[PDB]
């Protein structure tokens, strides 16, 4: 009952949301300018990626990117790569250097970039959920205003964050600060065209959390959270993914991300940012 959907960035590229396993998302990046394809977070249930390519889409399927080592995000790397070299390739497997990701051929660290066709894929270190978790920031260098796809794995969900399996609240605060300030260089102009593609369909539960926990009942952010919650629920009701949200939206509806805003930390009145993250996590 879970549907695909496609978010498109101008004429430059698109990202297809591919529901996999029970509540996972894998993604297919498609560079329109070179017809180059890349897959993100390929697990044991990878055939739906292939099914999508052979209904909807000569193309070059060059890259697999894994946000983190967990099997529901890396368990299809070796198998899809094999497929893939047999039908074409050279297939590059990108993963965080410190996560020892299955089948990785391009270990990456903060600031690294890899190309997918003409698209740039910039790497952000976000250790917490796993010690080597990364985020992938994807855009077209020649079409920067067409927007950005941000693959956040299990670090950040819509209105949520991942469990701290291999780290702590300080790690998560640091990750939220990195995400919050991605576009500081352009005075956050690109926030509204930066789209968040996370690891799982956990939106419902987190949006209920945001609605209950938002501290300021006089703000229209509450009305916004309520409207967004209903919108995501309706999507999920028809089988549509709740994802993506924009970074502009997350800055309103995601209380964990808002820990990166000193004014919000003050408003919550639960101590400093670390204390606040702990409160929200616990909570
Ligand atoms: Zn995980
Ligand atoms: Zn996961």
UniProtKB/TrEMBL annotation:
<feature type="domain" description="Metallo-beta-lactamase">
    <location>
        <begin position="23"/>
        <end position="200"/>
    </location>
</feature>
<dbReference type="GO" id="GO:0004416">
    <property type="term" value="F:hydroxyacylglutathione hydrolase activity"/>
</dbReference>
<dbReference type="InterPro" id="IPR036866">
    <property type="entry name" value="RibonucZ/Hydroxyglut_hydro"/>
</dbReference>
<feature type="binding site">
    <location>
        <position position="154"/>
    </location>
    <ligand>
        <name>Zn(2+) 1</name>
    </ligand>
</feature>
<comment type="similarity">
    <text>Belongs to the metallo-beta-lactamase superfamily. Glyoxalase II family.</text>
</comment>
<dbReference type="InterPro" id="IPR035680">
    <property type="entry name" value="Clx_II_MBL"/>
</dbReference>
<feature type="binding site">
    <location>
        <position position="72"/>
    </location>
    <ligand>
        <name>Zn(2+) 2</name>
    </ligand>
</feature>
<keyword id="KW-0862">Zinc</keyword>
<dbReference type="InterPro" id="IPR001279">
    <property type="entry name" value="Metallo-B-lactamas"/>
</dbReference>
<feature type="binding site">
    <location>
        <position position="200"/>
    </location>
    <ligand>
        <name>Zn(2+) 2</name>
    </ligand>
</feature>
<dbReference type="GO" id="GO:0046872">
    <property type="term" value="F:metal ion binding"/>
</dbReference>
<feature type="binding site">
    <location>
        <position position="154"/>
    </location>
    <ligand>
        <name>Zn(2+) 2</name>
    </ligand>
</feature>
<feature type="binding site">
    <location>
        <position position="129"/>
    </location>
    <ligand>
        <name>Zn(2+) 1</name>
    </ligand>
</feature>
<feature type="binding site">
    <location>
        <position position="73"/>
    </location>
    <ligand>
        <name>Zn(2+) 2</name>
    </ligand>
</feature>
<keyword id="KW-0378">Hydrolase</keyword>
<feature type="binding site">
    <location>
        <position position="70"/>
    </location>
    <ligand>
        <name>Zn(2+) 1</name>
    </ligand>
</feature>
<dbReference type="InterPro" id="IPR032282">
    <property type="entry name" value="HAGH_C"/>
</dbReference>
<keyword id="KW-0479">Metal-binding</keyword>
<dbReference type="Pfam" id="PF16123">
    <property type="entry name" value="HAGH_C"/>
</dbReference>
<feature type="binding site">
    <location>
        <position position="68"/>
    </location>
    <ligand>
        <name>Zn(2+) 1</name>
    </ligand>
</feature>
<protein>
    <submittedName>
        <fullName>Putative glyoxalase II</fullName>
        <ecNumber>3.1.2.6</ecNumber>
    </submittedName>
</protein>
């Amino acid at each position: 009952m879970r549907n695909y959907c496609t978010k498109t960035f101008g004429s430059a590229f698109s990202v297809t949301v591919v529901p996999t396993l029970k509540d996972n998302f894998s993604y297919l990046i498609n560079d329109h300018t070179t017809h180059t394809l890349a897959a993100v977070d390929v697990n044991a249930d990878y055939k739906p990626i292939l099914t999508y390519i052979e209904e909807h889409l000569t193309y070059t399927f060059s890259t697999i990117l894994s946000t983190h080592k967990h099997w529901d995000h890396s368990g299809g790397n070796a198998k899809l790569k094999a497929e893939l070299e047999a039908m074409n390739v050279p297939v590059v497997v990108v993963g965080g250097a410190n996560d020892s990701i299955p089948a990785v051929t391009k270990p990456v660290r903060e600031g690294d970039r890899v190309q997918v066709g003409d698209l740039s894929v910039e790497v952000i270190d976000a250790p917490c959920h796993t010690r080597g978790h990364v985020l992938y920031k994807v855009q077209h260098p020649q079409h920067p205003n067409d927007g950005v796809a941000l693959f956040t794995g299990d670090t950040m969900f819509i209105a949520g964050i991942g469990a701290f399996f291999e780290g702590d609240e300080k790690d998560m605060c640091r990750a939220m600060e990195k995400v919050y300030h991605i576009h500081k260089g352009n005075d956050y102009a690109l926030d509204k065209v930066t789209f968040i593609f996370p690891g799982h369909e956990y939106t419902s539960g987190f949006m209920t959390f945001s609605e209950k926990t938002f501290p300021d009942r006089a703000s229209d952010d509450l009305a916004f959270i309520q409207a967004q919650r209903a919108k995501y629920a309706a999507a999920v009701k028809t089988g549509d993914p709740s994802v993506p949200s924009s970074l502009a939206e997350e800055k309103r509806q995601n209380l964990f991300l808002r820990v990166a805003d000193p004014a919000f930390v003050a408003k919550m009145n639960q101590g400093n940012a670390h204390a606040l993250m702990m409160y929200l996590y616990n909570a």
